[PDB]
Amino acid sequence: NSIQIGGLFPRGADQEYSAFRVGMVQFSTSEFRLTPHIDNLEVANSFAVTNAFCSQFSRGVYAIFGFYDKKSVNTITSFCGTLHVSFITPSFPTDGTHPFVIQMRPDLKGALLSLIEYYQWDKFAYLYDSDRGLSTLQAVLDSAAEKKWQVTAINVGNINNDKKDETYRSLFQDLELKKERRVILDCERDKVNDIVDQVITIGKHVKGYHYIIANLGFTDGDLLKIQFGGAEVSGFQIVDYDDSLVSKFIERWSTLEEKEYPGAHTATIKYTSALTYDA
Amino acid sequence: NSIQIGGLFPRGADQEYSAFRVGMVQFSTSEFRLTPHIDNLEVANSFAVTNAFCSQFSRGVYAIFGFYDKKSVNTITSFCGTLHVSFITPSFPTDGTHPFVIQMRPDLKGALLSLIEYYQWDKFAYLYDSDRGLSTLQAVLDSAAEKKWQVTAINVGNINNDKKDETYRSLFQDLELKKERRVILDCERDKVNDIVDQVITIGKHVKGYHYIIANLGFTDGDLLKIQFGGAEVSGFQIVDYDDSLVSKFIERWSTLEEKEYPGAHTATIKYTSALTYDAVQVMTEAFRNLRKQRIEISRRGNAGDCLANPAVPWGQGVEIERALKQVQVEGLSGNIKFDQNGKRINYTINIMELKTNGPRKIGYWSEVDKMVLTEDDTSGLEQKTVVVTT
Amino acid sequence: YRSLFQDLELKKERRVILDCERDKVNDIVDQVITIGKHVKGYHYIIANLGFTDGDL
Numbered sequence: 258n259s260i261q262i263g264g265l266f267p268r269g270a271d272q273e274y275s276a277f278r279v280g281m282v283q284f285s286t287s288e289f290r291l292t293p294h295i296d297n298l299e300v301a302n303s304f305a306v307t308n309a310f311c312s313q314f315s316r317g318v319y320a321i322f323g324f325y326d327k328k329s330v331n332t333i334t335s336f337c338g339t340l341h342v343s344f345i346t347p348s349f350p351t352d353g354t355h356p357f358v359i360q361m362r363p364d365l366k367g368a369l370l371s372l373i374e375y376y377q378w379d380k381f382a383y384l385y386d387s388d389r390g391l392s393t394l395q396a397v398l399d400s401a402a403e404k405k406w407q408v409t410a411i412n413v414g415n416i417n418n419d420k421k422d423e424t425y426r427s428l429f430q431d432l433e434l435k436k437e438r439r440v441i442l443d444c445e446r447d448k449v450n451d452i453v454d455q456v457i458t459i460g461k462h463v464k465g466y467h468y469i470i471a472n473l474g475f476t477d478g479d480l481l482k483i484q485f486g487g488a489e490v491s492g493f494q495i496v497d498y499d500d501s502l503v504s505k506f507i508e509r510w511s512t513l514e515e516k517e518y519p520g521a522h523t524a525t526i527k528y529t530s531a532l533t534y535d536a
Numbered sequence: 537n538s539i540q541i542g543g544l545f546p547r548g549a550d551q552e553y554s555a556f557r558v559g560m561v562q563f564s565t566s567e568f569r570l571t572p573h574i575d576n577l578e579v580a581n582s583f584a585v586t587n588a589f590c591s592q593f594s595r596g597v598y599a600i601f602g603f604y605d606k607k608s609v610n611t612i613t614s615f616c617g618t619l620h621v622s623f624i625t626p627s628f629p630t631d632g633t634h635p636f637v638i639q640m641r642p643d644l645k646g647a648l649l650s651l652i653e654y655y656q657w658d659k660f661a662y663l664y665d666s667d668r669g670l671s672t673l674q675a676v677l678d679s680a681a682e683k684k685w686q687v688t689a690i691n692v693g694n695i696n697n698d699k700k701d702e703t704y705r706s707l708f709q710d711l712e713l714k715k716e717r718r719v720i721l722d723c724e725r726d727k728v729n730d731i732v733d734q735v736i737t738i739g740k741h742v743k744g745y746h747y748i749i750a751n752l753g754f755t756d757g758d759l760l761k762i763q764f765g766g767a768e769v770s771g772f773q774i775v776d777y778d779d780s781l782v783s784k785f786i787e788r789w790s791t792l793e794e795k796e797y798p799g800a801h802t803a804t805i806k807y808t809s810a811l812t813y814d815a816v817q818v819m820t821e822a823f824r825n826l827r828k829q830r831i832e833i834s835r836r837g838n839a840g841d842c843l844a845n846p847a848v849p850w851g852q853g854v855e856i857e858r859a860l861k862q863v864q865v866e867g868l869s870g871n872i873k874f875d876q877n878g879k880r881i882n883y884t885i886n887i888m889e890l891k892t893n894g895p896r897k898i899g900y901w902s903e904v905d906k907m908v909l910t911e912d913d914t915s916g917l918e919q920k921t922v923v924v925t926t
Numbered sequence: 927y928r929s930l931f932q933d934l935e936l937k938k939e940r941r942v943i944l945d946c947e948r949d950k951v952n953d954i955v956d957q958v959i960t961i962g963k964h965v966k967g968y969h970y971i972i973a974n975l976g977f978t979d980g981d982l
Contacts, residue, residue, distance in 0.1 A: 302614060311843055335583045402710050482960070
């Protein structure tokens with residue numbers, strides 16, 4: 258039995274798509290089969306998202322799936338909320354409760370709170386990228402009342418790649434005036450990479466500083482570049498690799514040729530793709 | 537040569553629509569007379585927004601007008617950017633340089649930071665609703681970093697109205713944990729007045745507290761309710777009632793029956809409505825200039841459905857946007873001028889203080905001149921009886 | 927390398943004059959980066975004419 262469903266995907270999310278088809282293969286059943294309607298539109302154009310949404314609605318799909326921008330979240334909640342169409346999503350959790358919005362990404366902020374509670378920091382800078390939503394920051398501020406924290410949040414995402422350089426050195430130099438030893442980064446994998454790189458170049462990966470990477474990709478991140486700096490570093494993983502089902506997943510995940518499923522021929526996997534495959 | 541236009545007024549904004557009617561009256565002209573497609577739909581519902589939008593798009597209206605939620609900003613921005621359709625709003629400005637976007641609100645940010653610099657504060661609470669956006673928060677934090685400020689921001693706006701009383705008690709106690717004496721407020725006027733009433737009940741309207749109302753319409757609130765509590769209060773104002781043009785506007789304003797024009801029969805007015813009237817003047821005179829351009833643009837409902845794949849926008853409106861941006865004319869908020877980014881520019885925002893006799897100006901704020909104090913001291917009232925502890 | 931500089935740490939040396947060919951120069955520099963011992967308080971001298979030729 259064919260079962261039509263939506264399949265929105267941002268371009269450059271190839272790993273999640275490959276893993277998606279892997280999900281189609283692994284869990285296909287004799288009783289019925291899913292009928293994906295793949296769509297590779299950018300999430301930045303909410304209007305285009307509306308277009309694809311009406312398109313799959315024309316397809317009459319019983320479900321819709323894909324990533325969403327904070328720019329698009331209100332759109333998806335509005336439409337799926339209106340038409341009572343379900344929409345599973347890997348992306349960051351909604352700041353507001355909604356009907357028909359299943360969401361694959363666990364809330365992370367409370368663990369972050371407990372984490373700080375363990376490290377018992379009194380004061381620290383807190384960089385953030387807007388795109389995942391500022392709500393987490395709001396939370397850290399709330400505790401800052403209760404925990405008398407003197408956090409100094411600063412956005413980073415506005416910066417262009419073209420001048421993506423001196424702004425950093427000026428930034429950390431600004432951090433030096435407070436002589437900050439402790440920062441919890443909250444950025445995307447790529448931004449995580451560039452930031453870690455600049456930290457290397459300025460050499461603040463030395464012992465006496467500390468970092469916390471606020472995402473599930475803490476293992477996904479290439480921390481080898483800073484493993485030997487002596488500064489302590491800690492983060493999060495939603496997917497233990499020591500797990501039996503996980504290791505079994507790895508046994509074949511390496512096997513796939515990149516030509517069929519690019520980005521899949523690796524020892525590990527982005528947690529988001531894993532959320533897709535689970536979804 | 538009547539010109540079809542949009543009309544997206546959120547429910548309960550009667551004074552705004554009435555002001556819109558007054559705008560239709562004040563600038564009606566033989567060369568053309570505007571043809572509103574007025575609608576009353578929830579601003580929060582992006583779906584319905586898209587519905588009416590595509591409806592007027594089916595009308596192929598050459599211009600559109602209405603507000604937008606922060607939830608809906610991305611909507612209308614994405615539509616103006618995709619369909620190359622010009623639009624005007626009195627809502628709070630986008631954080632990005634979005635094409636085909638006109639906006640009546642000069643950013644209150646720089647004047648606010650300037651004000652903070654004027655009081656030379658170092659520690660303060662920052663209450664905020666989410667609804668106008670967190671841009672001011674990002675800004676105040678940004679300045680806070682360099683200035684070694686100790687921000688205490690809090691999201692008051694998510695609190696349920698069902699018990700919009702209980703939370704406040706713990707809330708101000710939270711301030712008392714640090715004994716904050718300095719509290720920026722960033723909410724819409726209703727929430728503002730409510731919270732102020734709570735300040736009354738907790739009695740923190742007493743002298744030695746200071747307050748800041750972050751809004752274009754500082755006079756709109758019920759300041760009289762706490763005029764004599766002794767706590768200092770001050771805020772920004774985009775609307776000078778003292779202006780003779782504004783004066784005459786009042787002369788026609790309060791006099792009108794509120795039945796035909798709800799929200800109009802008063803001595804006061806929302807800054808929003810003034811932005812509306814100003815938007816009417818701007819659009820109207822803009823097309824007046826189009827007539828000088830003689831660039832014919834008339835078309836039927838050629839636009840059809842908004843889901844054309846790909847949709848291909850007609851470029852005459854792209855020219856119309858250029859015609860709009862170049863407009864430079866006086867309004868209720870003083871001069872109106874646009875950058876090609878579509879933000880208002882080279883404007884002015886009068887500072888206001890709550891003197892015991894009543895609210896009062898002390899200066900004005902150009903974006904380029906920054907803060908500008910006015911001498912207006914009225915030769916000093918009194919020393920207000922100096923406290924002498926011992 | 928890490929063992930080597932760790933051995934240097936016992937003397938807490940702040941000052942070294944490297945004397946190597948440009949390739950091994952670049953490699954040793956990279957390792958110094960990875961161990962991070964190029965913060966203020968250290969110093970280096972590269973004993974060759976290629977001091978500009980190498981990346982710095």
